[PDB]
Design a protein around this ligand. Structure first.
Ligand SMILES: O=c1ccn([C@H]2C[C@H](O)[C@@H](COP(=O)(O)O)O2)c(=O)[nH]1
Ligand SMILES: O=c1ccn([C@H]2C[C@H](O)[C@@H](COP(=O)(O)O)O2)c(=O)[nH]1
Lengths: 316, 316
């Protein structure tokens, strides 16, 4: 079954995984150096052993493909995966004349009343982002996010580079090149970034008329983040291929620090007691070819029949 | 035996490797996505199934660790691995009033007389680099090479960053960090680089008092280049550890395009008919701790007993 490598990766970390402390002071079981491989021709690797919200992955990826870094678009899509990131800028700024919010995310875990307060302050921030056009320009622009890294790398000459755009053109004219790389890691920015890109870099490759992509992820939360990263980048591999008029090959996930948070152990064994069902099918709009122009409605997911979702706390 | 993963990698490409054309118009057998793993505690992964010149690897790595980009140092060390790179700048410049040299490297293969002529023009260029101090500053500085990438990344503000230096300090103060990354890939420079860095990026990791390093190499010549890359980076893993007062763990080599040039096939089967002997031992100077200050004499290699070297043409 297609998602087997993920179950394997999970089972493995439980077994060979040595305990290792981390940034967020939660404990983790970690393995360093691991690579898995999905044959995107057998189906779409969206986990069927626990429900993954394809809509979130889809609207996020498009945001990236638009070289966009503002939350307004995700909000317009009911997506809030990046709220806290913009919200935290809002709270540390001169305008935020509201209640206590320092360390909001962590405190939410054991709220004194905090939860409903935080959840409402967010409802405020978000609505304003969506409406106060000037508010959005200030507290809704995350700045250096995958979108600006893939499609607007700032150079030492005050200019901007579209790595992805260029790489697509390369695939079109020199498909056998070994330099089809897009990077998210900028030495200059990581020293003061809130969250240095985990999805550090990826590489395209073509052969036998099929396109492959290898992602190198520096750090991966096996339970929460990995299921999404497999889905984001496999979708990318389809889009880019559909654009270059190529067939889809394999998606290859390489890890630096693959870990399983100590508070996730029960949930993961829970998942490992399930049997995968056949993998869904991705159906892309045949009329559209400029992936940069793709819309939510141009990407269909057929035959997705997953097991109920598993709930677990975001370790911080 | 320690070098087994390399023999495995080679044998594999012969088998699963699909033919794929490339830049240099030589044909290659290629596989995309592969990772191997050497336990640096069992010994040093310098191949014993064919003699690898440790001296070349050693003097090169130091050059890198010095944030140096000039050929003068390698020349002072009998190392010429980077000559053609500086030499080619020399020939395309106003001063080079000499014989035909356009495409010199390729033409050398089937010389009309070219070989001895080229080999002498080089003897000239090199001697001048070593002596004409001003000549060196002009045609001996490669510019953007691993040394300037690891230890002097130019920022958008006309400044310079010492990625490696910083990463070492990080290891010292936050050994459990998942952000111990040094990058060689600069989006701005690759569009006009002669040879974009193959050894694209590496990641440090610490746990149980042992240091590990994972290299991500975009493209790898299995026969010629891989044996060296395994040796360079494993040596790095030892140096950095000796500096941070840690034990050495594993070296992990991940590949993008692992290939075996069509003109190397006989030589590689030749090598695969040999049996590995026990792996050598690396002995580092105990008095010295600042790896940035290491000298050729501070690195000893004990028990190196290899099979005769195998000769093969540099495919271009
Ligand atoms: O696809 C993704 C994106 C993010 N994260 C996680 C990785 C880390 O667990 C956490 C960031 O912690 P640091 O590695 O930066 O310290 O976010 C994932 O697991 N998968
Ligand atoms: O450790 C190393 C350094 C360089 N090369 C090779 C990789 C490629 O075969 C060639 C450069 O060709 P491109 O990939 O840049 O097209 O140099 C290696 O094999 N190993």
């Amino acid at each position: 079954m297609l998602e087997q490598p993920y179950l394997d990766l999970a089972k493995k970390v439980l077994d060979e995984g040595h305990f290792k402390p981390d940034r967020t002071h939660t404990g983790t079981y970690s393995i360093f150096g691991h690579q898995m491989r999905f044959d995107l021709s057998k189906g779409f690797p969206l986990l069927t052993t626990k429900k993954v919200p394809f809509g979130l992955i889809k609207s996020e990826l498009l945001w990236f493909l638009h070289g966009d870094t503002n939350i307004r678009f995700l909000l317009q899509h009911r997506n809030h995966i990046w709220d806290e990131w913009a919200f935290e800028k809002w709270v540390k700024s001169d305008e935020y004349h509201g209640p206590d919010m320092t360390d909001f995310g962590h405190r939410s875990q054991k709220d004194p009343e905090f939860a409903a307060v935080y959840h409402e302050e967010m409802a405020k921030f978000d609505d304003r982002v969506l409406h106060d056009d000037a508010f959005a320009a200030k507290y809704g622009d995350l700045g250096l996010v995958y979108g600006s890294q893939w499609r607007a790398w700032h150079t030492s000459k005050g200019d901007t580079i579209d790595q992805l755009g260029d790489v697509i053109e390369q695939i079109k004219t020199h498909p056998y090149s070994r330099r089809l790389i897009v990077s998210a890691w900028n030495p200059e920015d990581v020293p003061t970034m809130a969250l240095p890109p985990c999805h550090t870099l990826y590489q395209f490759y073509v052969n036998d008329g099929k396109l492959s992509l290898q992602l190198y992820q520096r750090s991966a939360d096996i339970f929460l983040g990995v299921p999404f990263a497999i889905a984001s980048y496999a979708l990318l591999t389809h889009l880019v291929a559909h654009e270059c008029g190529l067939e889809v090959g394999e998606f290859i996930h390489t890890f630096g620090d693959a870990h399983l948070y100590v508070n996730h152990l029960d949930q993961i064994k829970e998942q490992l007691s399930r049997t995968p069902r056949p993998a869904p099918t991705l159906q892309l709009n045949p009329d559209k070819h400029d992936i940069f122009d793709f819309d939510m409605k141009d990407i269909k997911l057929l035959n997705y029949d997953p097991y109920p979702a598993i709930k677990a706390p975001v370790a911080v």
